[PDB]
From a paper:
The isoform GPX4 belongs to a subfamily of selenium-containing GPX enzymes and is unique in that it can also reduce hydroperoxides in complex lipids such as phospho­lipids, cholesterol and cholesteryl ester hydroperoxides, even when they are inserted into biomembranes or lipoproteins. The catalytic mechanism of the GPX reaction involves redox shuttling of this selenocysteine between the redox states selenol (Se–H) and selenenic acid (Se–OH). The catalytic site of GPX enzymes was initially suggested to consist of a catalytic triad formed by a selenocysteine, a glutamine and a tryptophan residue. This was later extended by a conserved asparagine to form a catalytic tetrad, which in human GPX4 consists of Sec46, Gln81, Trp136 and Asn137. Recently, GPX4 has been identified as a key player in ferroptosis, a non-apoptotic cell death resulting from the iron-dependent accumulation of lipid reactive-oxygen species.
To prevent the heterogenous modification observed both with the racemic mixture of ML162 and with the pure enantio­mers, we produced a mutant form of GPX4 in which the second reactive cysteine, Cys66, was mutated to a serine (termed GPX4C66S). Mutation of Cys66 to serine, along with optimization of binding reaction conditions and the use of enantiomerically pure (S)-ML162, enabled the determination of a co-crystal structure at 1.54 Å resolution. The crystal belonged to space group P212121, with one GPX4C66S molecule per asymmetric unit. Clear difference density allowed the building of a complete inhibitor ML162 covalently linked to Sec46. As expected from mass spectrometry, the Cl atom of the inhibitor is lost and the acetamide moiety forms a covalent bond to the Se atom of Sec46. In the absence of a deep binding pocket within the active site of GPX4, it occupies a shallow surface pocket at Sec46 where, in addition to the covalent bond to Sec46, it also forms interactions with the three other residues of the catalytical tetrad (Gln81, Trp136 and Asn137). The side chain of Gln81 adopts a new conformation and rotates away from Sec46, which further enlarges the otherwise very small active site. Surprisingly, the thiophene group of the inhibitor does not engage in any interactions and instead is directed towards the solvent. By interacting with Sec46, Gln81, Trp136 and Asn137, the inhibitor targets all of the residues of the catalytic tetrad of GPX4 and thus fully blocks the active site.
Residue numbers in the entry: 6 to 171
C-alpha cells in the first residue's frame, strides 16, 4: 500500500454499501463530509438526522456525504452491509453509504489511513479515530480541511461550510 504519498481523497476507491467499487475521484469539485458510523449508539440518531439535514440543505451547492460503517467502537455496528443500508433508509439517507470497514490499525481502509495523517486530519490527542461519528471535511480538491470529533454534532460543521463553497 502506497497511501502515505497520496495528496487527495480522489486517489482512493472504496466499495459502496451494495459491494460495488467506487472511484472517489467522482467527488472532484465537491465538498465532502467523510464519517464513520454505527447503528447502536446513543448518538446514532443525532448524527444521522443532522447529516441528512445538512445534505438536504447543501446538496444543491455541492455538499456530499460519505458514510463508512465501522464496528471498532464498542462493536456497535454488528450488522451486515444490507442491514446497515436498511437502517440508514429508516433515516431517509440520500447521501452515499459505503461497505463496513476498519478505520484504525493495519487493516484500516487506506483512505482513513491517509486522512488521519493530513495536517488538518490530526485529532485533539492524535491521529487515531477515537470513537463512532468522527467527521472529516474535505475540500473540492480532495484535501482534508477540518476534523470534528465524536462529541461534536454534525450541525457544528455548518458554520464552516460557506468558505469551502467559494
Ligand atoms: C455506539 C456507542 O456510542 N456506545 C455504546 C453503546 C452500547 C454498547 O454496548 C451495548 C457499547 Cl459497547 C457502546 C456508547 C453509548 O451509546 N453510550 C450512551 C448510553 C447508551 C445508549 C444506547 C444504548 C446503550 C447505551 C457507550 C460508550 C461506553 C459505554 S456505552
Amino acid at each position: 500500500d502506497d497511501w502515505r504519498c497520496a495528496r487527495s481523497m480522489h486517489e482512493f476507491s472504496a466499495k459502496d454499501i451494495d459491494g460495488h467499487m467506487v472511484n472517489l475521484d467522482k467527488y472532484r469539485g465537491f465538498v465532502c463530509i467523510v464519517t464513520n458510523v454505527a447503528s447502536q449508539x446513543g448518538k446514532t440518531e443525532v448524527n444521522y438526522t443532522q447529516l441528512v439535514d445538512l445534505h438536504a440543505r447543501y446538496a444543491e451547492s455541492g455538499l456530499r456525504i460519505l458514510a463508512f460503517p465501522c464496528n471498532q467502537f464498542g462493536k456497535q455496528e454488528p450488522g451486515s452491509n444490507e442491514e446497515i443500508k436498511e437502517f440508514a433508509a429508516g433515516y431517509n439517507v440520500k447521501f452515499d453509504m459505503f461497505s463496513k470497514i476498519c478505520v484504525n490499525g493495519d487493516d484500516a481502509h487506506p483512505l482513513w489511513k491517509w486522512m488521519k495523517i493530513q495536517p488538518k486530519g490530526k485529532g485533539i490527542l492524535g491521529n487515531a479515530i477515537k470513537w463512532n461519528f468522527t467527521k472529516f471535511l474535505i475540500d473540492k480538491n480532495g484535501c482534508v480541511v477540518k476534523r470534528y470529533g465524536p462529541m461534536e454534532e454534525p450541525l457544528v460543521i455548518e458554520k464552516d461550510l460557506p468558505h469551502y463553497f467559494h
